[PDB]
Design a protein around this ligand. Sequence first.
Ligand SMILES: Nc1ncnc2c1ncn2[C@@H]1O[C@H](COP(=O)(O)OP(=O)(O)OP(=O)(O)O)[C@@H](O)[C@H]1O
Ligand SMILES: Nc1ncnc2c1ncn2[C@@H]1O[C@H](COP(=O)(O)OP(=O)(O)OP(=O)(O)O)[C@@H](O)[C@H]1O
Ligand SMILES: [Mg+2]
Ligand SMILES: [Mg+2]
Length: 326
Amino acid sequence: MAPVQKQFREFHDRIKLAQYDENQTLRDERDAVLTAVREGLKKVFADRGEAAPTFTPFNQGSYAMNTGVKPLEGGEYDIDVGIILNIAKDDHDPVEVKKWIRDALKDYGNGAEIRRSCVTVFKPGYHVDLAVYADPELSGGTLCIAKGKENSGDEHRLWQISDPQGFQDRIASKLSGDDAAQFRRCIRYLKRWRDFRFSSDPLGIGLTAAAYWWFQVSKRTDPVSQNVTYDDRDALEQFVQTMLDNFHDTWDSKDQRSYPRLTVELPVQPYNDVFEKMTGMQMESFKSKLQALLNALKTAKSRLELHDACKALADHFGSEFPVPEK
Ligand SMILES: Nc1ncnc2c1ncn2[C@@H]1O[C@H](COP(=O)(O)OP(=O)(O)OP(=O)(O)O)[C@@H](O)[C@H]1O
Ligand SMILES: Nc1ncnc2c1ncn2[C@@H]1O[C@H](COP(=O)(O)OP(=O)(O)OP(=O)(O)O)[C@@H](O)[C@H]1O
Ligand SMILES: [Mg+2]
Ligand SMILES: [Mg+2]
């Protein structure tokens, strides 16, 4: 009946990255970029002959929500930060606003770059994704993120209504206590699976939103003593089965075939499918790999030898998954 709970908890200990509130180093790297933006902006706007825009920053992403993992060797940390500029959205092209930040981050690190949803700045061993918002007061009450690239057409340049506070609050409030800890462990486990079996360029946000909809705690409460034990292997099995169950074969007219697609809405504005950017072929590979992980989660629960159980898990979770010698 070989259990694997101790092995999962040790795996968790190895992969987890402390969130911003417990990570001096992350805060320091964060604050450095925010400082370089403030400093940078003074020059960019001295040129324009205009007073510098101010901004309010906030923590975003997994280091804000305590779902962060350590990258594998060669991999990069992803420091996500929002900045709310004291500007009215209706008065500015969003890409143009993003240009102020890239130019402010001209010299800092290996430079800065304007992505579709953020300005990203590169440094040795990490990047910082700055999501750029217009001021809700000056912009008629909504918080809108700057969407669009430099090369992007007109209909793809926009201020999209967002709700990062709402999203973070739903992730943190879904469960509590040791139930919530298991939720977070299972997101992390799957982000290492991602880093191990997917190429370095199943989104993090995808699995997070997915767990919000479909994660269920797996624990046993002894009827007599009320003593609780968690079963992380079982929690992943049910969660992964539930995701697989929600793939829909979706016809693509252009390719004249169907691909299995997992759709997962953000539980807050704008309720976009967080996986919409994955192509049909990437979704098909995502599904096969999910099925193979499910198969190993089941194999792991029916091995006499702890070695054989752990090995089956290590083939999917990678070489930081502990495999005790036979
Ligand atoms: N496709 C999307 N739709 C809506 N919001 C998103 C999307 N992608 C990212 N975000 C927002 O930006 C944040 C940072 O995105 P990122 O891709 O870094 O995910 P993350 O949660 O930090 O996970 P990871 O640990 O993989 O970095 C998310 O946590 C989410 O609030
Ligand atoms: N809705 C969102 N809210 C906040 N951040 C987001 C959102 N969507 C994406 N991001 C951020 O930007 C990063 C990548 O998303 P983006 O859509 O900008 O990629 P892209 O510019 O299309 O690049 P690629 O060429 O790789 O497709 C994520 O890691 C995340 O931090
Ligand atoms: Mg992130
Ligand atoms: Mg990011």
